[PDB]
Amino acid sequence: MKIVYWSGTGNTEKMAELIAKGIIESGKDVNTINVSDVNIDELLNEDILILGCSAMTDEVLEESEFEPFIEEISTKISGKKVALFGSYGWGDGKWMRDFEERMNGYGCVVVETPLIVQNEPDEAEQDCIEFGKKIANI
Ligand SMILES: Cc1cc2nc3c(=O)[nH]c(=O)nc-3n(C[C@H](O)[C@H](O)[C@H](O)COP(=O)(O)O)c2cc1C
């Protein structure tokens, strides 16, 4: 499996690492890839796209890297299974509600409830691991 994410301070990166840990604990392998290093062709071959990005600007996906990435894969993911996650601060998940609607609009099948964690995981570390385990069970 593959996890692709964007993180500005490391919070979403930490989530990605924990999600990977859950998948691995379930007995499977998974590679964690920063969005700037992603290879689209290899990504689109995946059974499940695990995508993460923190809340940016005013409740939107990060604009310089993650957003263009989503726009690029948008027309070649209809029917693809996807799982979404990200860290946020002061809001209550609007950016993620929009991210989910967006992916559904591209024809994707959102396999689990998107995982959103406030700031660094900390107490929510296990929640991140469990999300990975659910994805590994699909
Ligand atoms: C420029 C900027 C804008 C942000 N906009 C939002 C927002 O609209 N809603 C929210 O809840 N958090 C917002 N945040 C807070 C981040 O989502 C939060 O700090 C998160 O933990 C960062 O994760 P990261 O290290 O993976 O980037 C913003 C942070 C920055 C730097």
For 1-138, strand residue ranges (E) read 2-6, 31-34, 48-53, 81-88, 109-110, 115-118
Give the distance from CA 73 to its chain's centroid: 14
The residue extents of the domains of the chain are: 1-138
- Largest pairwise CA distance in the chain: 38
Tell me if 122 CB under 6 Å of ligand 1: no
Among 103, 129, 102, 105, which Cα is nearest to 117's?
129
Residue with CA nearest ligand 1 atom 28: 56
Which residue reads 């929009």 in tokens?
Answer: 98
CA-to-CA distance for 2 and 93, rounded, in angstroms? 24
Token duo for residue 112:
């689990």
Looking from the CA of residue 58, the nearest atom of ligand 1 is 8
Residue 30's CB is within 10 A of a number of other CB atoms, namely 22
Please state the three-class secondary structure of 19-48 as a single string: HHHHHHHCCCCCEEEEHHHCCHHHHCCCCE
Tell me if 5 CB under 6 Å of ligand 1: no
Resolution of this PDB entry, in A? Answer: 1.6
H or E segment to which residue 95 belongs? helix 94-105
Q: From the options 3.40.140.10, 1.10.260.40, 3.40.50.360, 3.30.930.10, give the CATH code of 1-138.
A: 3.40.50.360
